[PDB]
Design a protein around this nucleic acid. Structure first.
Ligand SMILES: [Mg+2]
Ligand SMILES: [Mg+2]
Ligand SMILES: [Mg+2]
Ligand SMILES: [Mg+2]
Ligand SMILES: [Mg+2]
Ligand SMILES: [Mg+2]
Ligand SMILES: [Mg+2]
Ligand SMILES: [Mg+2]
Ligand SMILES: [Mg+2]
Ligand SMILES: [Mg+2]
Ligand SMILES: [Mg+2]
Ligand SMILES: [Mg+2]
Ligand SMILES: [Mg+2]
Ligand SMILES: [Mg+2]
Ligand SMILES: [Mg+2]
Ligand SMILES: [Mg+2]
Ligand SMILES: [Mg+2]
Ligand SMILES: [Mg+2]
Ligand SMILES: [Mg+2]
Ligand SMILES: [Mg+2]
Ligand SMILES: [Mg+2]
Ligand SMILES: [Mg+2]
Ligand SMILES: [Mg+2]
Ligand SMILES: [Mg+2]
Ligand SMILES: [Mg+2]
Ligand SMILES: [Mg+2]
Lengths: 97, 29, 251, 135, 114, 65, 91
RNA sequence: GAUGGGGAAGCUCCGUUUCAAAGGCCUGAUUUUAUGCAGGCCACCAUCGAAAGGGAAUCCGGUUAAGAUUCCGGAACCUGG
RNA sequence: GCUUGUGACGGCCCGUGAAAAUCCACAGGAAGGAAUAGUUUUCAUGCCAGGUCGUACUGAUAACCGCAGCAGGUCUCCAAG
């Protein structure tokens, strides 16, 4: 699965949730991997992809809506995009995903 | 010379507005 | 006697349609070079309600290919379309819900609506809410396609007639009871003057063929001939059967 | 990595110059006392040159290629970075954080930026930077 | 106290026959006919009211200077600034996708050339 | 072709009659078992239906003049 | 508390029109005044106005649907059929 | 409700953009010099139909036998040039 | 408190609740242009003009219609303790 990797990264690692924080981390180059929900608007998705092209970071397209992504990261609200600042005991950045 | 730049149009089938052609075959006389 | 009511409805004085709040006639785009050879893209701007009509309407705007101008068409909304959506129309359009394709470009079993009967009349068949036409075969020679209509009948159309992919929105409308004469009043108010209806057996013999006599009755059978002379056609017109179509009264 | 460096072309997203292209001259990732956000001292063009053909005489050619510049301090949130670049070393010591007071100095910086942009618009460099964005 | 009348010849309570009651320098109560209220202008693609633009009946827009009808930005008295920046980002990203399409079409053709 | 008119009209009436009988059977099957169900079954079925009813920009060069 | 034991929203009709007709109208009224999920937005904000039109209050988008439900089962089967036919024809 | 057309022995009937060669702006160029062509347009087809619908702009004080948001005194505004 | 104007909400529909004249803005970049000047009368001040027809009074147990100075009929605004 990928929910187990996301849960291990959240239990031991640094992350951020949301568009503005993700764009700031992509701006000063601190991100490692961004995760975009399937139901996000295509314009915001394409802008996040252009930012990831300029900052040389990886993109992962999560199958599922923003509320399923929020449940997968362990929150009681909906999340459109996650940015993984640091992975500890997980290996989400180093695996096939 | 080098301030002019070529830009060919795409008269296509759904791309640009068609130019004025000789429509004398289709005149309502 | 005198002139009876169904005779009176043809002079069209107080029996014309109530068309003030209606959005315009709903028809397909005019067939031209772009739809005949390739495709063209428009965008649906709003989905609105039309007075006197069960199905909603869609306002799809296209571009003029010979003049710098915009052209706005009125489609009937298929179930699933939304604002901000691209509509593709023409010969080379893809098989997606909302697109306008010729009938020779669809495979068998496809569900279409707003189908032209002749190629170029901009929409005749399956226009009410919840209705559709099923493609049930082709003929590559003779350039004909066989379809099944909403009434059950089979028809053969030219392959150059167009249609919109999908089923028309607003289905399940008659599954609700009206419960009230005022609801029926407000329904027919925006269509035409045809409600309420007096029974012909409750009139005098000057007013109707069924009128007169003590103990309200129709004296003879109510099946009329097909060659009656337009003051006589009151009842069941040219009936091949009568009965219940069910034969059991309870299912 | 950290890509918003000096010489990178961006597009202004809001604030009277929305839709205009821009060269970043000096970044500020932390932000001073004034402007406490992360910002960037930039230079761009307000009036674009018009198209020119073979039919125009020399006077109308000279008229249809003037360039009106501007200099600005702008938030990072109101810029949109592109992948193009430009060589910024001509007007590099004229745009500083003390230039944006004393508007005689802003006029003096605008003249240098105008000369450098017209020189680069001659000889056919950076047609994407000297073209207009249609929106 | 005292009771008032209409000052025109329309005796009916229509949408244009609206009155207010004022007290005059003569110490009496008089009716005063008030004009219809104005509606704010709207966004051409957003729907919402436009910030900065004054609200008037449509022929009183000819009696004011241009500062009252405009905002200093592209599409200034016409669009929203949210709708404007959305148009800017859409234009830039669509043109870059067209460049990507041309590049990958060249790559397919130069692969199929061999 | 003197038979084609009467045969096409006959086939069309039979197809229309089959469709009519089908839709009448379906509507009677809907109206009964709904008008013949009490408030208990009505509230239960209402509750049941309310319950269950590659960045692409990568192939693009960078620092371009 | 609980004000009607079994009638509910059809308590606005009193004793009129027949018990079976009130039982038939209750389901469609509950369905047409229900609130639905927004596919493009994620929130439960879709409401009906003017039967067939279903508008979301977040993201301000409107979708064409059924008379008393945002989507009908016939439309679901037709969308599945069109996806299968398109995939088989393109394949 | 005319016109273009089409009916009717005819008084007249249909129809309202129709199966019609259906009309204007101006740039021209400017110097028999005043305005012929202009060199680009021109998709709409007359007209009538609301003193309660839509709609540019005015208030106060005084004054008569009988008039006034109209006269007189003061103070405003709108359109066109 | 009473009458009235207005704002933000909410309920209802197999009912979703006019049109045109008219005015403004935006995109566009034609064309003209600053050096002894062009643009401005969308900034301020100053100048001139605003034609035709209606306008008194009743609006009802006496000014309207019912043969009448007829206990009938005939649309609406203001509203003190
Ligand atoms: Mg009519
Ligand atoms: Mg009946
Ligand atoms: Mg009787
Ligand atoms: Mg009798
Ligand atoms: Mg008789
Ligand atoms: Mg009888
Ligand atoms: Mg008998
Ligand atoms: Mg009026
Ligand atoms: Mg302003
Ligand atoms: Mg203002
Ligand atoms: Mg006539
Ligand atoms: Mg008139
Ligand atoms: Mg009037
Ligand atoms: Mg009105
Ligand atoms: Mg008087
Ligand atoms: Mg005076
Ligand atoms: Mg009142
Ligand atoms: Mg305005
Ligand atoms: Mg008078
Ligand atoms: Mg008077
Ligand atoms: Mg009087
Ligand atoms: Mg009175
Ligand atoms: Mg009185
Ligand atoms: Mg009386
Ligand atoms: Mg009298
Ligand atoms: Mg009397």
């Amino acid at each position: 699965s990928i929910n187990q990797k996301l849960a291990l990264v959240i239990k031991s690692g640094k992350y951020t949730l949301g568009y503005k924080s993700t764009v700031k981390s992509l701006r000063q180059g601190k991100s490692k991997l961004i995760i975009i929900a399937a139901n996000t608007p295509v314009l915001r998705k394409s802008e996040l992809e252009y930012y990831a092209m300029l900052s040389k970071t990886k993109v992962y397209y999560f199958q599922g809506g923003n509320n399923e992504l929020g449940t997968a990261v362990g929150k009681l609200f909906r999340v459109g995009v996650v940015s993984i600042l640091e992975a500890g005991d997980s290996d989400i950045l180093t695996t096939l995903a | 010379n080098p301030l002019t730049h070529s830009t060919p149009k795409n008269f296509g089938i759904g791309q640009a507005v068609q130019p004025k052609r000789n429509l004398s075959r289709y005149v309502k006389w | 006697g005198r002139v009876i009511r169904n005779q009176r409805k043809g002079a069209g004085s107080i029996f014309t349609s109530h068309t003030r709040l209606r959005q315009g006639a709903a028809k397909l785009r005019t067939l031209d070079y772009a739809e005949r050879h390739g495709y063209i893209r428009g965008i649906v701007k709003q989905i609105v309600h039309d007075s006197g009509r069960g199905a909603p309407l869609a306002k799809v705007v296209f571009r003029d290919p010979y003049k710098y101008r915009l052209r706005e068409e009125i489609f009937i909304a298929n179930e699933g379309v939304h604002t901000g959506q691209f509509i593709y129309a023409g010969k080379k359009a893809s098989l997606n819900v909302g697109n306008v394709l010729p009938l020779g470009s669809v495979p068998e079993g496809t569900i279409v609506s707003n189908v032209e009967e002749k190629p170029g009349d901009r929409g005749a068949l399956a226009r009410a809410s919840g209705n559709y036409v099923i493609i049930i075969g082709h003929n590559p020679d003779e350039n004909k396609t066989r379809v099944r209509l909403p009434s059950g009948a089979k028809k053969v159309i030219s392959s150059d007639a167009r249609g919109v992919i999908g089923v028309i929105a607003g289905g399940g409308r008659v599954d609700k009871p009206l419960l009230k004469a005022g609801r029926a009043f407000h329904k027919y108010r925006l269509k035409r003057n045809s409600w309420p209806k007096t029974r012909g057996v409750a009139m005098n013999p000057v007013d109707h063929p069924h009128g007169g006599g003590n103990h309200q009755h129709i004296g003879k059978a109510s099946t009329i001939s097909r060659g009656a002379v337009s003051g006589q056609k009151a009842g069941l017109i040219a009936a091949r059967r009568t009965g219940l179509l069910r034969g059991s009264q309870k299912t | 990595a950290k890509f918003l460096k000096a010489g990178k072309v961006a597009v202004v997203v809001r604030g009277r110059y929305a839709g205009k292209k821009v060269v970043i001259v000096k970044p500020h990732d932390e932000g001073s006392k004034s402007h406490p956000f992360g910002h960037a001292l930039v230079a761009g063009i307000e009036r674009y040159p018009l198209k020119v053909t073979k039919k125009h005489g020399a006077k109308k050619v000279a008229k249809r290629t003037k360039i009106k510049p501007f200099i600005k301090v702008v938030n990072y949130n109101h810029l949109l970075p592109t992948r193009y670049t430009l060589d910024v070393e001509a007007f590099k010591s004229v745009v500083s954080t003390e230039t944006f007071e004393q508007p005689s100095q802003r006029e003096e910086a605008k003249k240098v930026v105008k000369k450098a942009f017209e020189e680069r618009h001659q000889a056919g460099k950076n047609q994407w930077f000297f073209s207009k964005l249609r929106f | 106290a005292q009771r008032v009348t209409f000052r025109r010849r329309n005796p009916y309570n229509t949408r244009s026959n609206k009155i207010k009651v004022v007290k005059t320098p003569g110490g009496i109560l008089r009716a005063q006919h008030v004009k219809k209220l104005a509606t704010r202008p709207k966004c051409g693609d957003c729907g919402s009211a436009l910030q900065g633009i004054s609200t008037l009946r449509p022929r009183q827009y000819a009696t004011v200077s241009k500062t009252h009808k405009t905002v200093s930005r592209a599409y200034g008295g016409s669009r929203c600034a949210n709708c404007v920046k959305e148009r800017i980002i859409r234009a830039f990203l669509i043109e870059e996708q067209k460049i990507v399409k041309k590049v990958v079409k060249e790559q397919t053709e130069a692969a199929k050339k061999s | 072709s003197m038979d084609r008119d009467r045969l096409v009209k006959a086939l069309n009436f039979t197809n229309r009659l089959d469709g009519k009988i089908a839709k009448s059977i379906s509507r009677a099957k809907y109206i009964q078992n709904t008008r013949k169900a009490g408030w208990d079954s009505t509230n239960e079925t209402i509750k049941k239906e309310l319950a269950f009813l590659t960045n692409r920009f990568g192939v693009l060069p960078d620092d371009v003049e | 508390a609980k004000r009607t034991k079994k009638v509910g929203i059809t308590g606005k009709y009193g004793v009129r029109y027949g018990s079976s007709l009130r039982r038939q109208v209750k389901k469609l009224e509950i369905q047409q005044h229900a609130r639905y999920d927004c596919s493009f937005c994620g929130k439960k904000t879709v409401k009906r106005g003017a039967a067939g039109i279903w508008t979301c209050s977040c993201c301000k988008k409107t979708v064409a649907g059924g008379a008393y439900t945002v989507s009908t089962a016939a439309a679901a089967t037709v969308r599945s059929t069109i996806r299968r036919l398109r995939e088989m024809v393109e394949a």
